[PDB]
Symmetry: D2
Subunit: 258 residues, 4 copies
C-alpha cells in the first residue's frame, strides 16, 4: 500500500518499479483469487454504504499503455458491484466540440456526484501523455498542464472527492504478447486498430511521459499508485486492496433519519 | 411467458395480474436461483456481444410502487454484467432547469447510445403517474402525454432502440411488510422518507394511474410486461428470462 | 399575410411560390426598412415581456438552401434583441457521439426553456433533407421521420412551445449570384465550403425534399411559412411581421407579485 | 483606461473606488452616448470577426449587488451584437444536481467555445459571495475557493480564453433608489423578491466579500475591473471601451 504509493517529493523514478513484482502477496495465483473474492465482497458492501450515505464522491483514474489492463481491471475489480452507484467514463480521441473548449471541460463534466463511484478509463492525463509523445501541442503549452491538473484535483478533493489514480505498469515484452493475443483472439480482434503499432514504436517516449506526469501530479490529496500489471491476478488483487483500504478509511455511516 | 406481455389492444386490466403469481416457473426459490445463474451468464455474454457489435441500443424501463423492487432488480439481474456497457439513469424530483423544458427533455438526454444497455430507474412515465395522482399539471395536460410517449418510443424504436418496459407489480400488503422491514433495518432506514406515508394513502390512485399508463402505452415496438414482484426470486428470474430472450432475438454478431 | 402560411391539408406545391414575390408589401426597400425598424422595436419589447412572464417557450426554425439567408435573418431580425433571452443553436454535420443516438437527441437538447426564444439555424429537418438527398440512411428509415417530427413538435407545442418554421425560398439564379458574391468578398469567403457546389448540382432534389418536408410537417400547432427570400429587405420584413404577430397573439403579461 | 484595472498585488481596497466617479470621460451623458454608439459599432464588427476566425474564446464575467446593473450592461453593451456568437449564462440558486458535484462543475460547463463570446450574469464568484455572507458552507471550505478560482482561471487563460471580469460598483443609496424604482415600475416589479431585502440588510458583509474576492482573484491572466456603476451612461461606456480595446488587441483575422 505505502510501497506502491508515489510520495509527493518529486523524486519518482519508474525504473524503481518492476512490472513482474508480486512482493506484496505471498500465496501465488490460486491464493490471490480467493483473497480477491474476499476484497470484492467488501467492495460491494462499501459501495452500497457510499450510495446510502450519499456524501462522498469516489474517482478511480486508470492509466496504462495499450493492453496495459484498463478494461480487465474494470471487469474483474468491479464485478458484482451495483450499477446504480458505479459508472465508467471513457476518454478517447477528442471531437471538434471537445477541442473547442479547454482540455479539462470534457473531463470535469464526467466527475462523480455525491454517493457515486466513477472510473475514468483514460483521463485528463492523456493531455500530458499522448499530446506530449505525439507533439500535438508544444512543451510551452503541455508543461503548464501539470499545475492545472494538481489544482483541478485539489479543488475536487477539497470539495469532497476521494481521488485514486492507478498506473497499470506493464513491460514492453508483455505489451507485445498481449497485442498479439488480442489479434489472434476472434472475440478480441475488433479492439485492435492500426494506430496501436505507432504507440509501440514510441514506447520509450510514453515511459518518459508517464514518469514526468506521475512525478508532477502525485499529491497527498490525489496520490498515484504504480501497479505491477504484468500478472493480472496480482494487478486485480492490489487495485482491489488499495480501493477497499481507502473506502474503509472514509469511515462511512448509514444515515439515521427521524 | 408471453402471458406477461401486455397486448396493444387497449383492453388491459391490472386485476387480471396477481403479484403472488409464480405459474411461469415450475418449482420454487432454490430451483429459480440456479435457473437465474444460467440466465445471468447468458446476459453477461449477450451484453459483451452488444458492446462489441456496437449497433443496437437497449433501453430497460423499470416502474414500480415504492419498495416494488426497482433497486433489487438492477442489483441482481445485472450482477456481473460489465459496467462499460451498462448504465443506470435515475429519474427523481425534477429540478427548475428540468421543469423549464418539456418533461421529455431530461429523459431523452439519457437514452442509450449504440452498443449500450441503459436502465431507467423510474422514467418519463412518472409524468403520467405521480404527476397525475398529485395533479402537478391538470388532467387536460397529462392526458395528451400518452400519445407523446407512444410517439417518442416509436421514434426511438424506429431509430434502433430495443425497448423493454417492466412494471414490477407488488400488492398493498407486500408494500406494508417491505416498508416496515425498511424502517426496522438500520442499513435500509435511510431509504425511508416521511412522504412515503402520503404515497401509501394514494395506493388506489397510483394503481389506476399504472393501469391507464400500461393500457395506453403498451405497443408492438415498446411492450409493457407486468412482473409479479411479491417474490423477489420470481421477479429476478422472469425479468432475466424476458431480457435474455429479447437480446437472443437480436441475433447480434461479433464484428469481422 | 396569411397567404404564406402552409395549410395542414397536404396539398402544398412549392411552384405556387415565387422567390421574387413582394405582394404583401406595398412599396420597396426604403419603405420596408422603416416598417422593419417599427417591427424590430415591437420585437425587442415582446422578448422582454416573454423573459419577464417566464412561461412561454419560443422556437424559430430557419431552413434554406446554402446562401438562402439564414445568417442574415438572425442578424437583421434579432438586431437589438436582448442576448439574455435570445439563443442561436446551429445544426451541422453530426458527430459520432451524435449519430450514436437517434437523430432527435442532439436537437431536443437545444429546445428553448421557459421565457427563452431559440433560433434553430438548420434543424431536425436536415434529417429529411440532406439525409434524403444523399441517402445517408435508406428511404425506409427517413420516410418514417415525417411522423416522428410531427409528433415531436406536437409534444413541444402541447407542453408550451410556440413553433414558427420559416423556409427562406430563393431561386437557382439567386443562389449563383450569392455564392459568387460570397467567393469574391474577402470577409465572407470563409463561409464558402467546397461542398456548397455539390449541393448546388443537386438543387432539384433539394427542392423536391423541401416540398415533401413542408407538405408532411406543416401543422396547426407547428406551421410552415414560405418566405420569398430573393429580396433580403422583403425577407427581413415578412419574417419580423409573422414573428411579431405570433408573439402579440400570446397576450403575454408582466407578473404582478404580492 | 488602466486606472480601473485591479493590480495583482493583494493590496486592493474598495473604499479607494467612488461609485459616482466619471474621471475617465470628460464630455458628460450626451457626449458619452455618442462615444458608446461608436464603440458598439466596433464591438459588432469585432464579434463578427471572432466568430469567423473561430479560434479565441471570450469570457465576460459580471458581478454586482442586486440592481447593480448586470441586466442593463448586457442589454446596452451587447445591443445589436449578433446572437449567433453571443451567449448569456446566468448563475442562480444551485439545484440538487448542481450541489451534488463541486461548485465549479456547473460553471465550467458554460465556458465559451472557440469563436464564442459568453457573458456570465453572476458566476463561480457567488461561491465566495452569498456562500460566504450567508455561511452556506463553513469558512474552512469557502476560504480554499479563492485558490481554486485563480487556478481554474489560469487554466482557462492558458488554454486560449480572454477573461474580463467586471465588478459593477454601486453605492448603498443608489441600490435603495433602484430597488424602489423597480418596485414602483409595473414592467419591472416582477424583478423584485422578498429575499432582496435581506441582501440589503447584509450590505456591509457583501462589500467585505467583494473586496476579499477581488483582492484574492485579480490576476495578470484574469483581471478585475471596478466599474463605477452609479451613472449607467458611464458604466455602459467604460465596460464597452475595456471590451473593445481587449478584442482589438487580439488582432483577429478573417480565414482564407
Ligand atoms: N486528450 C487526448 N488527445 C489525444 N489523443 C487522446 C486524448 N485522449 C485520449 N486519446 C487517445 O485516444 C485513443 C482512444 O482509444 P480507445 O478509447 O482505447 O479505443 C487512445 O489511443 C488515447 O491515447
Ligand atoms: N416527473 C416527476 N414529477 C414529480 N416527481 C417525480 C417525477 N419523476 C420522479 N419523481 C419522484 O421523485 C422521487 C424520487 O425518489 P427516489 O426513488 O428516492 O430517488 C419519487 O418520489 C418519484 O415519484
Ligand atoms: N442531419 C444532418 N445530416 C447530415 N448533414 C447535416 C445534418 N444537419 C446538418 N448537416 C449539414 O452540415 C452542414 C453545416 O454547415 P454550416 O452551415 O457551415 O455549419 C451543412 O452542409 C448541412 O447540410
Ligand atoms: N453559488 C450560489 N449559491 C447560492 N445562491 C446562489 C449561487 N449562485 C447564485 N445564487 C443566487 O441565486 C439568485 C439568482 O437570482 P435571479 O437574478 O433572480 O435569477 C441570487 O440571489 C444569487 O445570489
Ligand atoms: Mg440576478
Amino acid at each position: 500500500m505505502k510501497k506502491y504509493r508515489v510520495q509527493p517529493d518529486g523524486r519518482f523514478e519508474l525504473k524503481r518499479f518492476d512490472p513482474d513484482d508480486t512482493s506484496a502477496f505471498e500465496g501465488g495465483k490460486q491464493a490471490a483469487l480467493e483473497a480477491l473474492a474476499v476484497l470484492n465482497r467488501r467492495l460491494e458492501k462499501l459501495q452500497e454504504l457510499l450510495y446510502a450515505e450519499g456524501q462522498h464522491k469516489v474517482l478511480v483514474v486508470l492509466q496504462a499503455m495499450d493492453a496495459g489492463g484498463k478494461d480487465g481491471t474494470i471487469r474483474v475489480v468491479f464485478d458484482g458491484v451495483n450499477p446504480s452507484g458505479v459508472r465508467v467514463a471513457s476518454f478517447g480521441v477528442p471531437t471538434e466540440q471537445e477541442l473547442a473548449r479547454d482540455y479539462l471541460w470534457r473531463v470535469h463534466q464526467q466527475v462523480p456526484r455525491k454517493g457515486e463511484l466513477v472510473i475514468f478509463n483514460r483521463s485528463h492525463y492523456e493531455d500530458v501523455l499522448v499530446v506530449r509523445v505525439k507533439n500535438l501541442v508544444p512543451q510551452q503549452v503541455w508543461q503548464k498542464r501539470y499545475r492545472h491538473i494538481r489544482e483541478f484535483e485539489r479543488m475536487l478533493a477539497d470539495e469532497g472527492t476521494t481521488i485514486l489514480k492507478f498506473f497499470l505498469h506493464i513491460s514492453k515484452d508483455e505489451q507485445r504478447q498481449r497485442l498479439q493475443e488480442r489479434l489472434d483472439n476472434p472475440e478480441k480482434r475488433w479492439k485492435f486498430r492500426m494506430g496501436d503499432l505507432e504507440d509501440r514504436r514510441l514506447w520509450d517516449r510514453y515511459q518518459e511521459a508517464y514518469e514526468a506526469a506521475i512525478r508532477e501530479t502525485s499529491t497527498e490529496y490525489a496520490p498515484w499508485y504504480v501497479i505491477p500489471a504484468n500478472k493480472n491476478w496480482y494487478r486485480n488483487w492490489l487495485v482491489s486492496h488499495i480501493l477497499v483500504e481507502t473506502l474503509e478509511g472514509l469511515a462511512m455511516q448509514y444515515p439515521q433519519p427521524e
